[model samples]
Target: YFQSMQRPSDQTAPGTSSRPILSAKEAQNFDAQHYFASLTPGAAAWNPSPITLPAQPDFVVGPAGTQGVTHTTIQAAVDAAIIKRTNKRQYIAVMPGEYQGTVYVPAAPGGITLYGTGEKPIDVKIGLSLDGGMSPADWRHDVNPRGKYMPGKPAWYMYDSCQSKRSDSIGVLCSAVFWSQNNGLQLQNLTIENTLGDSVDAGNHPAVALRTDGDQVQINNVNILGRQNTFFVTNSGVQNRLETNRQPRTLVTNSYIEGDVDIVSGRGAVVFDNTEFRVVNSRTQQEAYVFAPATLSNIYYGFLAVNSRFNAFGDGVAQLGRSLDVDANTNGQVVIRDSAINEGFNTAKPWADAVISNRPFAGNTGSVDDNDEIQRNLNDTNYNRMWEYNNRGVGSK
Candidate 1:
């Protein structure tokens, strides 16, 4: 039934064009209403309210020419907000300007929201280099005798390696935005980027621009643009390892996610709607846009992309992910419906690298049967206990 609808045009190259901007009206016109509204019994009551354009917060940060509680560094404001004892919601309003530093939003620092004060064009930029300048020691690990920089190669750009160790290298080696054990977080109207190089050693480094592991988190009206592992959403807490019944749940809507590999990868019940996914170019011997690299048997929820557009500039390549080096069980499933799929940069088949087998532990390895299960669960009424028809985006699918 879903394939019958007229799909959008596909792309032919990587980073050739920006993704189609999704308007509120276009999202409203889609069939998401019917899908969300049909949720089982009390499912409708548990959904979050429509995203409200939050008012400006009580905190401020910027370069030297501004006024109103200005801090030369963004971290000062972050430290200030974390020290507050009031139970009221905390907000960090960033004025329009280029912030040449790395900003981290931790999980322990909860109930804080960031709002941009100007047009969405380059408002607040927390720029960091993933080159040897950021992580020289890590860069030295590459096999290149004379460190080489190759464009279109995803490399380690933002870590504090021996090569790129400045006083401000605090968040370079770490996630641009790190989350510990926390919940009820929200990010709005901002551009989070990892200005790392995609050249050296195929960008083999594990530099994350923004990482989150919070529960009931809401990411609305935001733009997360980067290369490999752009937005890392985890739930393992301080240990950073996944355990049973300890993962967090999140909902991402009205946002734009752009990256090459694992652009949007995680293990949680994350619902993405009215969002635009941009697949960047990959170096030789690599694939583009690996959604989720979930391990087998965690009994936790994986990533779900609903009513979003997988718009890539490359030849519509669909590569299923492989489990990470860690042997943790990834029992969660990835359900993509009511969304558009374009070509990616790799030559992988429709099923990609997913290893399919009759074994129960194999999960759905991008096989015809796996596709069938996705279709059945979406069409069947008993898929998820909380599935509601009146929900927005592809949830209606």
Candidate 2:
């Protein structure tokens, strides 16, 4: 029998137990330090209780077959684990190596936990290249319909749907290299990457490395890499069913995420604690946006980056965030506090507009300096909310 414990504000150290406890009030409040402290290896406010795994793993994946190894691929191991469904949690341990192909974790019986046996996340690499809005000719077929078929053909010609239309919507459906659809899903010590290189030269297609819709999701010590839409988090499912009124919660700790535009964007509530956000630009030298949150107005918290570091590789400036107002009513919220910004970031103008035609509806807050340019950009009437707090580095106000 265990009881939840609420630490005082002065206490700086995290609980040593494998399952840290949190009070009801502390769990509801949004405090970066307290949130990271209360989090354990596999526990969160959404999943406050601790989960115990079986003595032996349900399945294991490795390059070469060995004794007690059930499968050679991660997907095969997950399929086997789903068959032995139980109320207890299931575990799948993958050996340290490179695994090519997309990994999809469906909504199965009992929650799933996939981890790597390597010393670090870099030892295990899972990569793929499925860009959003990619033409079938560049992907499925070898012939470009627009370049070859449309120019010389008459008005009435047999055309395949794949020739003209792009796949899915904004390529969110087919762009993720690692996708999770189950609740209470956890991933540790692994790298999810998209090998499609840069998006500017790649037709500006949306290439996502990881897309997760699972609730109570916890990711620790992981690396998510891509160019555009590197990490897509949302509560809505494929069928667009209203799963919950409140936004889903996802906690990412001690991870590394790098991209050019809106690397981290979604409608769910996400907290990046002690993580690193890197900006990698290979095309232009103007600037790039970090996050593009499309948070619904009903939701309170959108995305929070706490005690994290931001670094850039080139002369391109890095902006904090922008709004992806796919719907006119979405008032996206993003907070970057207690974080350090490098010189590569645009110190004066760190916010911009996306596809929104009218005005910037997203709310933003940080340690932005109260300058003429900063106030002019954020003082628009369409801005639902904006604030600033203690921030450090070259861009801090």
Candidate 3:
């Protein structure tokens, strides 16, 4: 199934403007850090690590009756944070335990950090079984009554986001285990998983683990687990799929992301440094993809990964990425540089076709944008902008 609604072909595409085309030589010399730093201006030479975690958090969440803990549930702690809103950064320390249901973070002005108390990310697990195939009413019935979300202010916003969208199914945006549109958000030292396994219709589920429609987000030392559409980074609220000056400039470092099809999907200037992406094929069976960047034609950057490793389960079953031409206007861009890939992938044809249109891979290697051909066919459809540089391993070679 296509990710978004396919528009009528006759109408001129919304965002089909010419973009800065990266020449073959320019791509070869591209540095991942520069892309991230450009997204985040005035940062001290960004190189992943030394991202500080809070020493004394504002709230603490532990087991159901743990002494001295601020709130038993994660939502309650978040509610407390929202009530005590600030322009500066705040923190909510989560102790080791299983946190169920959706953990929604509403729009915030400043920053909010949520980190685990345990030594490893797995020690604190925030997960639930939610599928995109469920209807909006079904989703409302399942989550609104639950004690985890009740009384929290974020819960009201979450309800409006899902229930307001008049669709048959709540869809991927509503099915996220950790859904947040909070700018200046930070997630660290936790394992967030969507446990909606492959019991649904074959290959139709869009279970999302971490769905952030926010900007200037930072993630470190986390384990984001799901089956499909796991890490969705986008700025959908913007009109006509246009680039917001405050693009979702997310920087994730030293994290572990596991999924199957279009695992890391959406539009954003995101950089993943020293991370490990695992392509699980138990449910996907044959083809498991790493990314599905829906970067609009105007955006210069989409998703960039450096100093990372991609390990899949089956032989020749893993693919690099597929362009998600959501709204018929995007030419998805992605670059995996200085990464290690395992033999489970098909090195011969790493990048898959466009997710919806099945547009084949044809790089516009023209030195200038005007000279570039094959960016779009006569139908106003765009091609994939996937590339790689200095990658090692049998799959990369």
Candidate 4:
């Protein structure tokens, strides 16, 4: 379809070495301005299109016996909304109060919008004190609450499989307080928290506030408070492996996410705009992680944070992010540009190592000074696309 492309002249180009070169530090000399300029979709703006809500909420939820309320709980409202899918967003308005339970949104044809009627995000709190360390029986007992989780409900299969697990614990994904598989799902003006807090011993116990596995998800003005794995965003469902280049996009804007380790962990294409990532290590008492992306090799856009802020409590107690080598071909891609970081992270080396494989950061740019230039291909499992551009703060050295 086109003529032969001739551009190179040098016989000895970069990456001609017999062995792959791997660097463990950040590419300080990398020119982010020029790199962003050459992209097909320029870096002037990178956020998803604004979402439009429905005309009116389909269901109104408040305390039991409250006037004009269709339901008393959030899950009950979602139950009704899931059936009224008509290629439009089904809205559920939750009143200003604290609801304690796990709310699961099954996949549906149309979208679902869950919003709060409170003055502030914290005024409406949905919380649970559960962790991944609990056995399946205990998890069932904690979430069941007698007549709530019946066999006819959509969440019953999830509860049944979770309770049927013969293992000691149900694991992380199953322990999410608010989990959703509804495409085009949106949550706004509320707070989702895991009340486990610092009650348990700070080891091997991972809890989550919100976990999503669908396309075109949007979160606005919400507060996600948890300890570990606060918000797990992924395209692949709870049972399947990570997809390649599907680019299930999730847009998080004007929100506050608080966690200690791997707060934002997933394999989806997520963009955080004007959000605040708060690191709370008082519970874990360990070095915290902000983002743990397990991006695939073929996917170029993994996690991008623009015009956001990263703040922590202690100095040098947190790292920017870590990679999750779920398989041999996973190369985590993360770019933090024009963000503000506080003095609570390690400035010497912001990016962290791998999780399962413990592979070091390759940091292999064709030229040691420039990261945009590639060597062979940037698909090595040992190499990650974790780079920073025009970031500011004490921790952004």
For residues 1-397, what per-residue lDDT tens digits would candidate 3 score against the true structure? 7577743122111122221233335554356555555443575544444547666778999976777698988878887887766788788999999988778887776678899989899999999888888888788776666554544465475666566767888887778888777887889899999988666544779999998877678899999998889889878552212344545678889999999999999888888989999998768687888989988776667888989999998879788888887766678888777688877998767777787778776544332246543232211234456766556777765
Q: How do the predictions measure up, each by TM-score? A: 0.66, 0.74, 0.84, 0.84
Task: Tell me the lDDT of model 2 at 20.
Answer: 16
Which candidate model has the greater lDDT, 3 or 4?
4
Tens-place lDDT digits, model 4, residues 1-397 = 8977953212122322221222222323222222222234544533445656566678988998887789988888988887665786788988899999989887788888899989999999999988988988788888878677778876665556566778978887678899888888999999999888888866766898998887768899999999888998776654533565455767888999999888898887787889999998778777788988888877666787878999988868788888877787777777776688877888766777788888875554455436554433444444577766556677665
What lDDT does each candidate get? 0.49, 0.65, 0.75, 0.76
Task: Tell me the TM-score of model 1.
Answer: 0.66
Could you give the C-alpha RMSD of every candidate to the true structure, in order shown?
A: 11.0, 11.2, 9.4, 8.4
In what order do the candidates fall by TM-score, top score first? Answer: 3, 4, 2, 1
**Stretch of 10 with least lDDT, candidate 3:** 11-20
- lDDT by residue for model 1 (163-255), tens: 343443323225443332346666677777766636544545445656666766777877877766677666555444554555456667888
Clashes per candidate (backbone, < 3 Å): 45, 1, 0, 1
Candidate number with the higher lDDT (2 or 4): 4
Instruction: Write one digit per residue (lDDT tens) for candidate 2, span 1-397.
Output: 7876943232111111211112223223445433233224665445333334457777788877576767776766766665666666788887888987666676655788888779999988988777766655454333222333243232112122223446443345456777777777888889999878653473356788988877778888899998878998877664532334546678888899988877897778788879999888775455577888777766556787878888876653777767777676576666665677776876555666654544543442212245522222222335542223345666553
